Design a binder for this molecule. Sequence first.
Ligand SMILES: CN1CCN(NC(=S)Nc2ccc(S(N)(=O)=O)cc2)CC1
Ligand SMILES: [Zn+2]
Length: 257
Amino acid sequence: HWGYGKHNGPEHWHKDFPIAKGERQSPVDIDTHTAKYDPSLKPLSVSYDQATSLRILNNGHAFNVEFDDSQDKAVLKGGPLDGTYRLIQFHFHWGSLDGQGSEHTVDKKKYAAELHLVHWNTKYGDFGKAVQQPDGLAVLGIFLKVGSAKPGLQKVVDVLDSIKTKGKSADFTNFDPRGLLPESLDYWTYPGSLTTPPLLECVTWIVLKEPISVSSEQVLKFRKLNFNGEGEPEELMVDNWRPAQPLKNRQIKASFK
Ligand SMILES: CN1CCN(NC(=S)Nc2ccc(S(N)(=O)=O)cc2)CC1
Ligand SMILES: [Zn+2]
């Protein structure tokens, strides 16, 4: 099965998932000088006040904080989007070292980690239908740099000891994802894909310009997770990022000058 190792990592994915070499793959390098301001782009509308978190799961590739998406409780609208996109889960990608871990890069710069808040277009009725559509998902991506702690992240950090290995989950109610956002909602946007298999080309990417800062201790705790299941040989969950893919026939648009 696919993963992030030498023998099953991103260079191998195309054999099971030929769309890996497709026309709108993610992530990409964001060349800030070549991105163009699009004055028609609207401000993002992030409406997370009624978000209902449920559970946190180690799925063997990352950990997901899952939400109740059976009603419009936490939604993303505006920006490049037409319609309403419901928050289903968030997760991170991170490195073994503070100088790598993000999936997107900015002028070739890698951040220590990247947060993905995953939303699906409610006109398609369920997430499984949405991933089959070119405008099915909107993923809000937020860079993490190492510096001061992010207080809104600490509850996530605190529970990781309970989901160390693949397949473990824990209750994770009453978590407020607003505590993970930076001050500014300025963003870049482009059409892309899931960054893991099955690599479906269903995502409108919205990547925030402003990173959040997390502490060295917070990211160290991410790095104590395991890719393996309990009772299997220990493999630290680190470097679970796909590198930047060719931009091909795409333009990245900026919401800001
Ligand atoms: C077919 N089916 C599609 C649903 N997939 N589930 C999820 S949560 N996939 C998923 C993968 C990568 C991202 S990312 N890193 O692009 O945000 C976001 C979501 C399971 C398999
Ligand atoms: Zn992701």
